[PDB]
Amino acid sequence: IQRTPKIQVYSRHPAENGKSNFLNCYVSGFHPSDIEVDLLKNGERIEKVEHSDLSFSKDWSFYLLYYTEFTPTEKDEYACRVNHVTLSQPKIVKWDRDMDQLSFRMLQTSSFANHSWAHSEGSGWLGDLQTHGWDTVLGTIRFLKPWSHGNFSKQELKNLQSLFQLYFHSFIRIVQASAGQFQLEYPFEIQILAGCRMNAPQIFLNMAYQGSDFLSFSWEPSPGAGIRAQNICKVLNRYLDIKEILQSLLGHTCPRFLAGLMEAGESELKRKVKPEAWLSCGPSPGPGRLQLVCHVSGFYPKPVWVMWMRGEQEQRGTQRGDVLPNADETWYLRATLDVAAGEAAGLSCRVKHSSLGGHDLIIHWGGENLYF
Ligand SMILES: *[C@@H]1O[C@H](CO[C@H]2O[C@@H](C)[C@@H](O)[C@@H](O)[C@@H]2O)[C@@H](O)[C@H](O)[C@H]1NC(C)=O
């Protein structure tokens, strides 16, 4: 299945229209991962445009964060331009002042453009935070956070490195072979999400193909997959050695390891960061109609609760848009409530979060203005 991407554009702080900042384009909900993105100054691609390693969500769709530093002027258009097969012309979204899990996850994506070429990325998260990555060239574990070692010995991991290195190297080789037997259509990608967690059961490992639950761990085919999975599971159910290997790795090794990542994290896990919030007038929807927007940002951990107010009286029109990430492993949420200019004054916006601890940030309105 193919899924047209969802460009979302937002800054990290507000513009005072003068002071240096980051811009975020965040692209998600898209398959296949062969994408091109760019950021724009008035028509112009920039350069020191950083982005995170690729990844994918519980529905196999992919997602990314593209960002750069820069300062704003009262002139100066900004926008996020994205091209991707399912699109019929680069859908460029414009920026605006006025807007517009205690489990160790190892995720892999191996893409297969043709017999000649292939490529794979792989990652190693813990809950929301990516703990590890893979060096494809040098064939080795990029550790990422410092405590990403856990209490696994220097030598302990040195081995796993290899046990993956073979794995990764085998995987491409084998599939490329199997390809025709099982009528895998080039180009195609195969995703995998394996790991530890809980506390009943413990293990897991799912393996989509063209963005679709295809195969899972004995080995079971997915109904939707059809005969292909059905077949592909046979070949695999028969290799007991393989079953057993993983059974040991994900069974009791990786959870021992999880235990490890968990206890070694703490100081950065039990970590709290105060938000920051401000105020818009997103586009007036129709006649004498306002649309004040909230802008909580820069907070961690994720769970945040946010309401447009008016004293203690919760305003139930508050719409709560998605939680994007900023680059500094923090969050950003934009809550929005729209009502007639007369209903407008007196409105607050209240931001509950663990980092404040009892003292919810309250943010009132004098348009297009904002305290405290
Ligand atoms: C096999 O595909 C190869 C990879 O093509 C990729 O290159 C990217 C930069 C992108 O633009 C897409 O074209 C692909 O994801 C390529 O090196 C070979 O020419 C292809 N071989 C044949 C025989 O068609």
Swiss-Prot record:
Disulfide feature: 294-349
A GO MF term: exogenous lipid antigen binding
Phenotype upon changing residue 169 to R: In allele CD1E*05
Keyword check for Signal: yes
PTM notes: Mono-ubiquitinated. Proteolytically cleaved in late endosomes to yield a soluble form.
The Ig-like domain, residue ranges: 255-365
Presence of the UniProt keyword Magnesium in the record: no
Any one biological process term the GO annotation gives: antigen processing and presentation, endogenous lipid antigen via MHC class Ib
Expression (tissue specificity): Expressed on cortical thymocytes, dendritic cells, Langerhans cells, on certain T-cell leukemias, and in various other tissues.
Glycosylation sites: 114, 151
Effect on the protein of changing residue 228 to W: In allele CD1E*03
Cellular component, GO, one term: plasma membrane
Effect of residue 216 to N: In allele CD1E*05
Quaternary structure annotation from Swiss-Prot or TrEMBL: Heterodimer with B2M (beta-2-microglobulin). The association with B2M appears to be facilitated by the presence of the propeptide.
Function according to Swiss-Prot or TrEMBL: T-cell surface glycoprotein CD1e, soluble binds diacetylated lipids, including phosphatidyl inositides and diacylated sulfoglycolipids, and is required for the presentation of glycolipid antigens on the cell surface. The membrane-associated form is not active.
Protein name as it appears in the record: T-cell surface glycoprotein CD1e, membrane-associated
Organism: Homo sapiens (Human)
Gene: CD1E
Part of the whole protein covered: 34 to 303 of 388
